[PDB]
Amino acid sequence: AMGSMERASLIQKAKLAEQAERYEDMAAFMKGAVEKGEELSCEERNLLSVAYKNVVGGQRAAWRVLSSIEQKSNGPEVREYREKVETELQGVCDTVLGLLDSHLIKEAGDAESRVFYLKMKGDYYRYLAEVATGDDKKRIIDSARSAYQEAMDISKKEMPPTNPIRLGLALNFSVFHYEIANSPEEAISLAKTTFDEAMADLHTLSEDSYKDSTLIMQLLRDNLTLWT
């Protein structure tokens, strides 16, 4: 429904929606921007990520509330409503994965862009995995793993160890290991090696880049504290 709006107007309205904390509108404006077919700039990639992370973040928090109530109960209403929220969440994940597959990833040739979109692919498969069960859960877990792994391979070859997207990728792949793949040792090892390699590279950074990197290193630290 955004096909008649100018790309630049969609981007401007995404930024306005962000200011107004209207994340569903923001995601719809950024979906329309992507569907114009042009590659996204660094700023525009961040708008896309913020919009959907806020939308899906709300759905995940709601799904968790409903799942807890449902598990305690174990009428059809709690299950029915958890399933409705779950379906809506899956639809948002499938929408984001669709944008990545058509055709953000294939056109992304620079390390910054390709790693950013593959991290997103890992994250949205991870969200699908959280609500999945059975073997269904297995192929979804492997899709999240594969995307994270390709992103990690490129980030290690192409980016310094303090690059914020490299750090955030490692952070989320470590959460995948801990929370999804039942590999807490792999999670802890990855977060520790990532933290230590970034610490050794901080001396190369300006004040502002130091601020950006140490913020994400603190997130790695917070997880290690929680997990150990």
Binding site for a second copy (CB under 8 A): 9, 12-13, 16-17, 19-22, 25, 61-62, 65-66, 69, 75, 77-78, 80-81, 84-85
* Residues near 180 by beta carbon (within 8 Å), at least 6 away in sequence: 126, 129, 130, 141, 144
3, interface contact from Mg ion, Cl ion, a second copy, none, CB < 5-8 Å by kind = none
77, interface contact from Cl ion, Mg ion, a second copy, none, CB < 5-8 Å by kind = a second copy
C-beta of 208: minimal distance to Mg ion in Å? 27
Phi-psi region of 182 (alpha: psi -120 to 50; beta: other; left: phi over 0): left
109 binds Mg ion (CB under 5 A): yes
80 binds Cl ion (CB under 5 A): yes
57 binds Cl ion (CB under 5 A): yes
134 binds Mg ion (CB under 5 A): no
C-beta of 34: minimal distance to a second copy in Å? 18
Residues 68 to 107: which contact Mg ion by CB under 5 A? 107
The residue (of 81 and 227) whose beta carbon lies closer to a second copy is 81
61 binds Cl ion (CB under 5 A): yes
Binding site for Cl ion (CB under 5 A): 57, 60-61, 80-81, 84, 109
